[PDB]
Amino acid sequence: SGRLWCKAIFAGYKRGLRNQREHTALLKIEGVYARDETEFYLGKRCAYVYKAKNNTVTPGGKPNKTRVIWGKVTRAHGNSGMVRAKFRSNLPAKAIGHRIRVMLYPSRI
Amino acid sequence: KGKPHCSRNPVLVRGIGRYSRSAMYSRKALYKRKYAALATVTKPVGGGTRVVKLRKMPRYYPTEDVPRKLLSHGKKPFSQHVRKLRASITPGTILIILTGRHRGKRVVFLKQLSSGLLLVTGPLSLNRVPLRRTHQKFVIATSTKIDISGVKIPKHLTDAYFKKKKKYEITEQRKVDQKAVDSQILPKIKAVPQLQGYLRSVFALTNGVYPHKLVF
RNA sequence: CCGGGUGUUACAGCCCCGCCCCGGCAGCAGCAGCUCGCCGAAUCCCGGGGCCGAGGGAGCGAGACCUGUGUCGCCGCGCUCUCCCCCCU
RNA sequence: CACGGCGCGUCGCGGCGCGCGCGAGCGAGCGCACGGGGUCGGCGGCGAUGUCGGCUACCCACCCGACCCGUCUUGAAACACGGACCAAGGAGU
RNA sequence: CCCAUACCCGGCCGUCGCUGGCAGUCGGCAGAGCGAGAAAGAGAGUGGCGCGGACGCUACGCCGCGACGAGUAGGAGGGCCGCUGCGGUGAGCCUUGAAGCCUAGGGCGCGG
RNA sequence: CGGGGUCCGGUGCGGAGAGCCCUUCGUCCCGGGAAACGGGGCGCGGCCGGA
Ligand SMILES: [Mg+2]
Ligand SMILES: [Mg+2]
Ligand SMILES: [Mg+2]
Ligand SMILES: [Mg+2]
Ligand SMILES: [Mg+2]
Ligand SMILES: [Mg+2]
Ligand SMILES: [Mg+2]
Ligand SMILES: [Mg+2]
Ligand SMILES: [Mg+2]
Ligand SMILES: [Mg+2]
């Protein structure tokens, strides 16, 4: 009935100043702003959900316009709650500053 | 011959015994345990008798074949894997299903099954979930428990019972088992005030609350 | 109550110094979970997250009286070929 | 306690060390594994005119990177020189 | 706390080294080893039923271990890269369609 | 009614954004608590409220 995930923003790729590695993304999870608070989210699955034009099949339902790129949280980043994430395919650059759902079912509690 | 005795040393740590070699030589009493030095069947036929050879040669060898594999030791089939359970999960605990069709429904937990799946049920009279299996990873175990140490669940229910077959029709055996379990579960949860409504409700996340902050 | 002055334990305290068993008692690099160290043949246990799984005929025992098998080498163990006793189903 | 037989025991210092014989250097099975590189004797869904797969290649978008080549030169993106574009010919015999 | 093509661990390609290993496919005519700390014989001798057992080995081949890989001028090697003609060879192809040319099609090779 | 005076309360801000509000499985019976002034109505016709 309600919402079962947590908001994150796809801030950007793991990068230096002149090089960027697109195989690792940086997520800003809402509400967590320090390293001693990000150990909860380590290993949780994350999803980038977006609409498209063509219909695609969905598990346990009729086809619709929704598509998803899956991934998982790997490790903390920085000192301010930033999180490193790895997805099965590198996220498109058009998702910079957009919503990624981090879920809870890879649970350890 | 000889009855198989148990191991003479308790496991101190995995792979290390409590007693040393000499202590074992003493405890086993080995000082007085010294020791010193198909493919054919004959059948009658109505002629005479024929020596039929079972395990006969194949009538077709393939163009080419793969070689054998090297031997490895630490790999075991899923049947005899050691089963682990989270410390926070004990019989009579409330869980929150996170991924099934019953998303975020508070459900009572009863028993760990043989293959590692949790046998779970919140009495479908109030939260509408039957006897079911659920993976222990995909559930949140809150720190609210009831006492179900004094309830009996049938021994016939198991993973073979819950295994999918093949439209799915519920069986009368399923109905009677669910009734038998819930007739004992329900009075226990009705003793605790405001617990039936809690199980009826559905967990959700609103803005301003974060799982890493909130405790359960 | 405050300010100034005198002064040497008074209606507060502080520092040093012989001994009383270095007076005695805990305790001790202290979860009074930060008062200050260097370590571990004087060190072990448990747990969590991430990435990967390349290689593919290793042999065992059977004895010229047999011809099987594919859980094998090194390493660490347990049980039996001795006899009793205890506990739980 | 990586101690475990009997002897002849000096193979010996006073017993321990440490030698000589004992069908003569042959006890066997099962089982578990922190043991010469992964397996499952574990599972779940969706599939006929709208859906599944197609790295690359066609077009488009985004983030990062990114100065036009050849040549002589210590130094070329150069306010150094040759070069509008395309086809064929073209130089260690 | 952040990250380089640096360092550590793993996979893959190639080069170099071990001037490494394999002719032992020794089968009812046989007995399946030469990885095991110690230069050298699983040494030869004379006296007190069921007929059965994968792959290999273009030796210019196959297989195993380590280390390493920048490059102008220049040197060398390999090209089952390419073009034209000649001697051989493919009981080669082809009017049931060759050469050539075009392609939003399917692929191979690090590359030609 | 607004602005001042006294006085009384709070002040690591409990008249707090480190907070507040709404909170959703649904339906059926009977009982208690709150309400009888309440709830719902392009169901209504007006009156003000805004540059
Ligand atoms: Mg730029
Ligand atoms: Mg020039
Ligand atoms: Mg020069
Ligand atoms: Mg000029
Ligand atoms: Mg000139
Ligand atoms: Mg010009
Ligand atoms: Mg030309
Ligand atoms: Mg390496
Ligand atoms: Mg080079
Ligand atoms: Mg074209």
PDB file of all heavy atoms in Angstrom, chain E residues 1-12:
ATOM      1  P     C E   1      39.202   6.772   6.004  1.00  0.00           P
ATOM      2  OP1   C E   1      38.419   5.520   5.910  1.00  0.00           O
ATOM      3  OP2   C E   1      40.681   6.711   6.040  1.00  0.00           O
ATOM      4  O5'   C E   1      38.786   7.708   4.787  1.00  0.00           O
ATOM      5  C5'   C E   1      37.425   8.012   4.539  1.00  0.00           C
ATOM      6  C4'   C E   1      37.279   9.202   3.626  1.00  0.00           C
ATOM      7  O4'   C E   1      38.053  10.313   4.131  1.00  0.00           O
ATOM      8  C3'   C E   1      37.782   9.020   2.207  1.00  0.00           C
ATOM      9  O3'   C E   1      36.846   8.341   1.393  1.00  0.00           O
ATOM     10  C2'   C E   1      38.047  10.450   1.759  1.00  0.00           C
ATOM     11  O2'   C E   1      36.842  11.078   1.352  1.00  0.00           O
ATOM     12  C1'   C E   1      38.511  11.106   3.060  1.00  0.00           C
ATOM     13  N1    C E   1      39.982  11.236   3.147  1.00  0.00           N
ATOM     14  C2    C E   1      40.585  12.307   2.491  1.00  0.00           C
ATOM     15  O2    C E   1      39.878  13.091   1.849  1.00  0.00           O
ATOM     16  N3    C E   1      41.921  12.468   2.554  1.00  0.00           N
ATOM     17  C4    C E   1      42.655  11.607   3.250  1.00  0.00           C
ATOM     18  N4    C E   1      43.973  11.808   3.284  1.00  0.00           N
ATOM     19  C5    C E   1      42.071  10.508   3.937  1.00  0.00           C
ATOM     20  C6    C E   1      40.743  10.362   3.864  1.00  0.00           C
ATOM     21  P     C E   2      37.346   7.433   0.174  1.00  0.00           P
ATOM     22  OP1   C E   2      36.181   6.689  -0.354  1.00  0.00           O
ATOM     23  OP2   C E   2      38.555   6.699   0.611  1.00  0.00           O
ATOM     24  O5'   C E   2      37.793   8.493  -0.920  1.00  0.00           O
ATOM     25  C5'   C E   2      36.850   9.372  -1.508  1.00  0.00           C
ATOM     26  C4'   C E   2      37.483  10.178  -2.610  1.00  0.00           C
ATOM     27  O4'   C E   2      38.337  11.191  -2.041  1.00  0.00           O
ATOM     28  C3'   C E   2      38.389   9.400  -3.546  1.00  0.00           C
ATOM     29  O3'   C E   2      37.653   8.771  -4.575  1.00  0.00           O
ATOM     30  C2'   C E   2      39.357  10.459  -4.065  1.00  0.00           C
ATOM     31  O2'   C E   2      38.791  11.147  -5.167  1.00  0.00           O
ATOM     32  C1'   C E   2      39.430  11.435  -2.894  1.00  0.00           C
ATOM     33  N1    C E   2      40.677  11.384  -2.100  1.00  0.00           N
ATOM     34  C2    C E   2      41.827  12.000  -2.593  1.00  0.00           C
ATOM     35  O2    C E   2      41.794  12.517  -3.715  1.00  0.00           O
ATOM     36  N3    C E   2      42.951  11.999  -1.849  1.00  0.00           N
ATOM     37  C4    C E   2      42.949  11.433  -0.648  1.00  0.00           C
ATOM     38  N4    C E   2      44.079  11.454   0.057  1.00  0.00           N
ATOM     39  C5    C E   2      41.787  10.818  -0.113  1.00  0.00           C
ATOM     40  C6    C E   2      40.680  10.829  -0.859  1.00  0.00           C
ATOM     41  P     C E   3      38.175   7.414  -5.243  1.00  0.00           P
ATOM     42  OP1   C E   3      37.061   6.859  -6.042  1.00  0.00           O
ATOM     43  OP2   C E   3      38.811   6.590  -4.189  1.00  0.00           O
ATOM     44  O5'   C E   3      39.301   7.897  -6.253  1.00  0.00           O
ATOM     45  C5'   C E   3      39.012   8.857  -7.260  1.00  0.00           C
ATOM     46  C4'   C E   3      40.241   9.201  -8.058  1.00  0.00           C
ATOM     47  O4'   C E   3      41.217   9.832  -7.185  1.00  0.00           O
ATOM     48  C3'   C E   3      40.946   8.007  -8.692  1.00  0.00           C
ATOM     49  O3'   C E   3      41.511   8.400  -9.936  1.00  0.00           O
ATOM     50  C2'   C E   3      42.060   7.712  -7.700  1.00  0.00           C
ATOM     51  O2'   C E   3      43.167   7.023  -8.238  1.00  0.00           O
ATOM     52  C1'   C E   3      42.433   9.115  -7.239  1.00  0.00           C
ATOM     53  N1    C E   3      43.060   9.148  -5.914  1.00  0.00           N
ATOM     54  C2    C E   3      44.291   9.780  -5.771  1.00  0.00           C
ATOM     55  O2    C E   3      44.802  10.312  -6.763  1.00  0.00           O
ATOM     56  N3    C E   3      44.884   9.804  -4.558  1.00  0.00           N
ATOM     57  C4    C E   3      44.292   9.216  -3.522  1.00  0.00           C
ATOM     58  N4    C E   3      44.908   9.262  -2.341  1.00  0.00           N
ATOM     59  C5    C E   3      43.038   8.558  -3.642  1.00  0.00           C
ATOM     60  C6    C E   3      42.465   8.543  -4.847  1.00  0.00           C
ATOM     61  P     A E   4      41.359   7.453 -11.220  1.00  0.00           P
ATOM     62  OP1   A E   4      40.933   8.294 -12.363  1.00  0.00           O
ATOM     63  OP2   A E   4      40.554   6.271 -10.826  1.00  0.00           O
ATOM     64  O5'   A E   4      42.842   6.959 -11.500  1.00  0.00           O
ATOM     65  C5'   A E   4      43.948   7.782 -11.164  1.00  0.00           C
ATOM     66  C4'   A E   4      45.106   7.552 -12.092  1.00  0.00           C
ATOM     67  O4'   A E   4      46.257   8.297 -11.624  1.00  0.00           O
ATOM     68  C3'   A E   4      45.604   6.122 -12.192  1.00  0.00           C
ATOM     69  O3'   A E   4      44.832   5.338 -13.080  1.00  0.00           O
ATOM     70  C2'   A E   4      47.046   6.305 -12.635  1.00  0.00           C
ATOM     71  O2'   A E   4      47.107   6.588 -14.023  1.00  0.00           O
ATOM     72  C1'   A E   4      47.436   7.568 -11.870  1.00  0.00           C
ATOM     73  N9    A E   4      48.057   7.252 -10.575  1.00  0.00           N
ATOM     74  C8    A E   4      47.439   7.049  -9.369  1.00  0.00           C
ATOM     75  N7    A E   4      48.266   6.783  -8.395  1.00  0.00           N
ATOM     76  C5    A E   4      49.510   6.811  -9.003  1.00  0.00           C
ATOM     77  C6    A E   4      50.805   6.608  -8.513  1.00  0.00           C
ATOM     78  N6    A E   4      51.083   6.323  -7.243  1.00  0.00           N
ATOM     79  N1    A E   4      51.825   6.709  -9.384  1.00  0.00           N
ATOM     80  C2    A E   4      51.555   6.994 -10.659  1.00  0.00           C
ATOM     81  N3    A E   4      50.382   7.208 -11.239  1.00  0.00           N
ATOM     82  C4    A E   4      49.392   7.097 -10.343  1.00  0.00           C
ATOM     83  P     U E   5      44.960   3.739 -13.074  1.00  0.00           P
ATOM     84  OP1   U E   5      43.690   3.170 -13.579  1.00  0.00           O
ATOM     85  OP2   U E   5      45.462   3.325 -11.745  1.00  0.00           O
ATOM     86  O5'   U E   5      46.089   3.435 -14.154  1.00  0.00           O
ATOM     87  C5'   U E   5      46.339   2.103 -14.582  1.00  0.00           C
ATOM     88  C4'   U E   5      47.608   1.988 -15.393  1.00  0.00           C
ATOM     89  O4'   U E   5      47.377   2.472 -16.742  1.00  0.00           O
ATOM     90  C3'   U E   5      48.812   2.763 -14.861  1.00  0.00           C
ATOM     91  O3'   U E   5      49.998   2.021 -15.136  1.00  0.00           O
ATOM     92  C2'   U E   5      48.802   4.016 -15.727  1.00  0.00           C
ATOM     93  O2'   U E   5      50.052   4.664 -15.835  1.00  0.00           O
ATOM     94  C1'   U E   5      48.347   3.447 -17.063  1.00  0.00           C
ATOM     95  N1    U E   5      47.742   4.423 -17.976  1.00  0.00           N
ATOM     96  C2    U E   5      48.434   4.697 -19.133  1.00  0.00           C
ATOM     97  O2    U E   5      49.500   4.176 -19.396  1.00  0.00           O
ATOM     98  N3    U E   5      47.836   5.600 -19.966  1.00  0.00           N
ATOM     99  C4    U E   5      46.637   6.242 -19.760  1.00  0.00           C
ATOM    100  O4    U E   5      46.227   7.035 -20.603  1.00  0.00           O
ATOM    101  C5    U E   5      45.979   5.901 -18.538  1.00  0.00           C
ATOM    102  C6    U E   5      46.540   5.021 -17.707  1.00  0.00           C
ATOM    103  P     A E   6      50.586   0.996 -14.050  1.00  0.00           P
ATOM    104  OP1   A E   6      51.561   0.113 -14.728  1.00  0.00           O
ATOM    105  OP2   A E   6      49.450   0.398 -13.307  1.00  0.00           O
ATOM    106  O5'   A E   6      51.386   1.930 -13.043  1.00  0.00           O
ATOM    107  C5'   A E   6      52.798   2.051 -13.104  1.00  0.00           C
ATOM    108  C4'   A E   6      53.352   2.398 -11.749  1.00  0.00           C
ATOM    109  O4'   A E   6      52.656   3.566 -11.250  1.00  0.00           O
ATOM    110  C3'   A E   6      53.144   1.331 -10.685  1.00  0.00           C
ATOM    111  O3'   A E   6      54.214   0.402 -10.658  1.00  0.00           O
ATOM    112  C2'   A E   6      53.015   2.133  -9.398  1.00  0.00           C
ATOM    113  O2'   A E   6      54.295   2.479  -8.900  1.00  0.00           O
ATOM    114  C1'   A E   6      52.337   3.406  -9.890  1.00  0.00           C
ATOM    115  N9    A E   6      50.866   3.375  -9.786  1.00  0.00           N
ATOM    116  C8    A E   6      50.040   3.609 -10.849  1.00  0.00           C
ATOM    117  N7    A E   6      48.771   3.561 -10.562  1.00  0.00           N
ATOM    118  C5    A E   6      48.758   3.290  -9.212  1.00  0.00           C
ATOM    119  C6    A E   6      47.690   3.121  -8.332  1.00  0.00           C
ATOM    120  N6    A E   6      46.420   3.209  -8.719  1.00  0.00           N
ATOM    121  N1    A E   6      47.968   2.860  -7.044  1.00  0.00           N
ATOM    122  C2    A E   6      49.255   2.775  -6.683  1.00  0.00           C
ATOM    123  N3    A E   6      50.354   2.919  -7.426  1.00  0.00           N
ATOM    124  C4    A E   6      50.037   3.179  -8.704  1.00  0.00           C
ATOM    125  P     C E   7      53.956  -1.168 -10.868  1.00  0.00           P
ATOM    126  OP1   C E   7      55.211  -1.771 -11.367  1.00  0.00           O
ATOM    127  OP2   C E   7      52.701  -1.347 -11.634  1.00  0.00           O
ATOM    128  O5'   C E   7      53.721  -1.712  -9.394  1.00  0.00           O
ATOM    129  C5'   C E   7      54.637  -1.410  -8.355  1.00  0.00           C
ATOM    130  C4'   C E   7      53.993  -1.559  -7.003  1.00  0.00           C
ATOM    131  O4'   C E   7      53.058  -0.473  -6.782  1.00  0.00           O
ATOM    132  C3'   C E   7      53.156  -2.809  -6.813  1.00  0.00           C
ATOM    133  O3'   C E   7      53.936  -3.947  -6.497  1.00  0.00           O
ATOM    134  C2'   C E   7      52.193  -2.402  -5.710  1.00  0.00           C
ATOM    135  O2'   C E   7      52.840  -2.449  -4.448  1.00  0.00           O
ATOM    136  C1'   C E   7      51.942  -0.936  -6.057  1.00  0.00           C
ATOM    137  N1    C E   7      50.735  -0.750  -6.894  1.00  0.00           N
ATOM    138  C2    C E   7      49.464  -0.826  -6.327  1.00  0.00           C
ATOM    139  O2    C E   7      49.337  -1.072  -5.124  1.00  0.00           O
ATOM    140  N3    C E   7      48.377  -0.647  -7.108  1.00  0.00           N
ATOM    141  C4    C E   7      48.528  -0.385  -8.403  1.00  0.00           C
ATOM    142  N4    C E   7      47.436  -0.209  -9.144  1.00  0.00           N
ATOM    143  C5    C E   7      49.808  -0.295  -9.006  1.00  0.00           C
ATOM    144  C6    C E   7      50.870  -0.477  -8.220  1.00  0.00           C
ATOM    145  P     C E   8      53.595  -5.366  -7.162  1.00  0.00           P
ATOM    146  OP1   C E   8      54.769  -6.252  -6.997  1.00  0.00           O
ATOM    147  OP2   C E   8      53.052  -5.118  -8.516  1.00  0.00           O
ATOM    148  O5'   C E   8      52.415  -5.930  -6.259  1.00  0.00           O
ATOM    149  C5'   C E   8      52.606  -6.154  -4.872  1.00  0.00           C
ATOM    150  C4'   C E   8      51.316  -6.537  -4.199  1.00  0.00           C
ATOM    151  O4'   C E   8      50.432  -5.389  -4.149  1.00  0.00           O
ATOM    152  C3'   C E   8      50.495  -7.599  -4.906  1.00  0.00           C
ATOM    153  O3'   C E   8      50.956  -8.914  -4.657  1.00  0.00           O
ATOM    154  C2'   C E   8      49.093  -7.330  -4.388  1.00  0.00           C
ATOM    155  O2'   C E   8      48.944  -7.843  -3.073  1.00  0.00           O
ATOM    156  C1'   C E   8      49.093  -5.805  -4.308  1.00  0.00           C
ATOM    157  N1    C E   8      48.554  -5.182  -5.535  1.00  0.00           N
ATOM    158  C2    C E   8      47.176  -5.103  -5.709  1.00  0.00           C
ATOM    159  O2    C E   8      46.444  -5.567  -4.826  1.00  0.00           O
ATOM    160  N3    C E   8      46.681  -4.529  -6.825  1.00  0.00           N
ATOM    161  C4    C E   8      47.510  -4.045  -7.745  1.00  0.00           C
ATOM    162  N4    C E   8      46.987  -3.485  -8.833  1.00  0.00           N
ATOM    163  C5    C E   8      48.920  -4.106  -7.594  1.00  0.00           C
ATOM    164  C6    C E   8      49.392  -4.675  -6.484  1.00  0.00           C
ATOM    165  P     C E   9      50.907 -10.011  -5.825  1.00  0.00           P
ATOM    166  OP1   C E   9      51.687 -11.192  -5.387  1.00  0.00           O
ATOM    167  OP2   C E   9      51.244  -9.339  -7.101  1.00  0.00           O
ATOM    168  O5'   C E   9      49.378 -10.439  -5.879  1.00  0.00           O
ATOM    169  C5'   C E   9      48.772 -11.090  -4.776  1.00  0.00           C
ATOM    170  C4'   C E   9      47.293 -11.274  -4.986  1.00  0.00           C
ATOM    171  O4'   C E   9      46.622  -9.990  -4.945  1.00  0.00           O
ATOM    172  C3'   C E   9      46.875 -11.850  -6.325  1.00  0.00           C
ATOM    173  O3'   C E   9      47.048 -13.250  -6.420  1.00  0.00           O
ATOM    174  C2'   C E   9      45.429 -11.399  -6.430  1.00  0.00           C
ATOM    175  O2'   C E   9      44.599 -12.192  -5.599  1.00  0.00           O
ATOM    176  C1'   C E   9      45.515 -10.002  -5.823  1.00  0.00           C
ATOM    177  N1    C E   9      45.717  -8.973  -6.865  1.00  0.00           N
ATOM    178  C2    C E   9      44.592  -8.462  -7.504  1.00  0.00           C
ATOM    179  O2    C E   9      43.479  -8.878  -7.164  1.00  0.00           O
ATOM    180  N3    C E   9      44.740  -7.529  -8.464  1.00  0.00           N
ATOM    181  C4    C E   9      45.959  -7.112  -8.793  1.00  0.00           C
ATOM    182  N4    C E   9      46.060  -6.190  -9.748  1.00  0.00           N
ATOM    183  C5    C E   9      47.126  -7.617  -8.166  1.00  0.00           C
ATOM    184  C6    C E   9      46.961  -8.540  -7.213  1.00  0.00           C
ATOM    185  P     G E  10      47.475 -13.902  -7.822  1.00  0.00           P
ATOM    186  OP1   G E  10      47.822 -15.322  -7.593  1.00  0.00           O
ATOM    187  OP2   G E  10      48.457 -13.000  -8.466  1.00  0.00           O
ATOM    188  O5'   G E  10      46.136 -13.859  -8.680  1.00  0.00           O
ATOM    189  C5'   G E  10      44.964 -14.501  -8.210  1.00  0.00           C
ATOM    190  C4'   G E  10      43.766 -14.183  -9.065  1.00  0.00           C
ATOM    191  O4'   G E  10      43.404 -12.785  -8.928  1.00  0.00           O
ATOM    192  C3'   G E  10      43.935 -14.357 -10.560  1.00  0.00           C
ATOM    193  O3'   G E  10      43.892 -15.704 -10.987  1.00  0.00           O
ATOM    194  C2'   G E  10      42.805 -13.502 -11.102  1.00  0.00           C
ATOM    195  O2'   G E  10      41.558 -14.155 -10.921  1.00  0.00           O
ATOM    196  C1'   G E  10      42.862 -12.316 -10.147  1.00  0.00           C
ATOM    197  N9    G E  10      43.743 -11.265 -10.681  1.00  0.00           N
ATOM    198  C8    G E  10      45.046 -11.010 -10.341  1.00  0.00           C
ATOM    199  N7    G E  10      45.562 -10.022 -11.015  1.00  0.00           N
ATOM    200  C5    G E  10      44.540  -9.612 -11.854  1.00  0.00           C
ATOM    201  C6    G E  10      44.509  -8.583 -12.821  1.00  0.00           C
ATOM    202  O6    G E  10      45.408  -7.796 -13.131  1.00  0.00           O
ATOM    203  N1    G E  10      43.274  -8.505 -13.447  1.00  0.00           N
ATOM    204  C2    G E  10      42.206  -9.319 -13.184  1.00  0.00           C
ATOM    205  N2    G E  10      41.091  -9.100 -13.887  1.00  0.00           N
ATOM    206  N3    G E  10      42.225 -10.284 -12.285  1.00  0.00           N
ATOM    207  C4    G E  10      43.415 -10.373 -11.666  1.00  0.00           C
ATOM    208  P     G E  11      44.721 -16.149 -12.286  1.00  0.00           P
ATOM    209  OP1   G E  11      44.788 -17.628 -12.315  1.00  0.00           O
ATOM    210  OP2   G E  11      45.972 -15.358 -12.319  1.00  0.00           O
ATOM    211  O5'   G E  11      43.809 -15.672 -13.499  1.00  0.00           O
ATOM    212  C5'   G E  11      42.480 -16.148 -13.627  1.00  0.00           C
ATOM    213  C4'   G E  11      41.742 -15.448 -14.738  1.00  0.00           C
ATOM    214  O4'   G E  11      41.591 -14.042 -14.424  1.00  0.00           O
ATOM    215  C3'   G E  11      42.421 -15.447 -16.095  1.00  0.00           C
ATOM    216  O3'   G E  11      42.239 -16.660 -16.797  1.00  0.00           O
ATOM    217  C2'   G E  11      41.786 -14.247 -16.780  1.00  0.00           C
ATOM    218  O2'   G E  11      40.492 -14.576 -17.261  1.00  0.00           O
ATOM    219  C1'   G E  11      41.625 -13.279 -15.610  1.00  0.00           C
ATOM    220  N9    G E  11      42.733 -12.314 -15.522  1.00  0.00           N
ATOM    221  C8    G E  11      43.743 -12.284 -14.598  1.00  0.00           C
ATOM    222  N7    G E  11      44.570 -11.294 -14.779  1.00  0.00           N
ATOM    223  C5    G E  11      44.075 -10.633 -15.891  1.00  0.00           C
ATOM    224  C6    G E  11      44.547  -9.483 -16.563  1.00  0.00           C
ATOM    225  O6    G E  11      45.534  -8.789 -16.307  1.00  0.00           O
ATOM    226  N1    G E  11      43.738  -9.154 -17.642  1.00  0.00           N
ATOM    227  C2    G E  11      42.621  -9.844 -18.025  1.00  0.00           C
ATOM    228  N2    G E  11      41.960  -9.384 -19.091  1.00  0.00           N
ATOM    229  N3    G E  11      42.170 -10.915 -17.404  1.00  0.00           N
ATOM    230  C4    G E  11      42.940 -11.250 -16.355  1.00  0.00           C
ATOM    231  P     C E  12      43.433 -17.268 -17.677  1.00  0.00           P
ATOM    232  OP1   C E  12      43.046 -18.642 -18.075  1.00  0.00           O
ATOM    233  OP2   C E  12      44.709 -17.034 -16.962  1.00  0.00           O
ATOM    234  O5'   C E  12      43.440 -16.366 -18.984  1.00  0.00           O
ATOM    235  C5'   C E  12      42.293 -16.290 -19.811  1.00  0.00           C
ATOM    236  C4'   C E  12      42.390 -15.143 -20.782  1.00  0.00           C
ATOM    237  O4'   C E  12      42.410 -13.886 -20.059  1.00  0.00           O
ATOM    238  C3'   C E  12      43.648 -15.089 -21.628  1.00  0.00           C
ATOM    239  O3'   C E  12      43.638 -15.988 -22.719  1.00  0.00           O
ATOM    240  C2'   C E  12      43.692 -13.627 -22.035  1.00  0.00           C
ATOM    241  O2'   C E  12      42.734 -13.367 -23.046  1.00  0.00           O
ATOM    242  C1'   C E  12      43.217 -12.954 -20.750  1.00  0.00           C
ATOM    243  N1    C E  12      44.355 -12.574 -19.885  1.00  0.00           N
ATOM    244  C2    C E  12      45.018 -11.384 -20.167  1.00  0.00           C
ATOM    245  O2    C E  12      44.623 -10.694 -21.113  1.00  0.00           O
ATOM    246  N3    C E  12      46.065 -11.006 -19.408  1.00  0.00           N
ATOM    247  C4    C E  12      46.457 -11.776 -18.399  1.00  0.00           C
ATOM    248  N4    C E  12      47.494 -11.369 -17.670  1.00  0.00           N
ATOM    249  C5    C E  12      45.806 -12.999 -18.089  1.00  0.00           C
ATOM    250  C6    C E  12      44.769 -13.357 -18.850  1.00  0.00           C
TER     251        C E  12
END
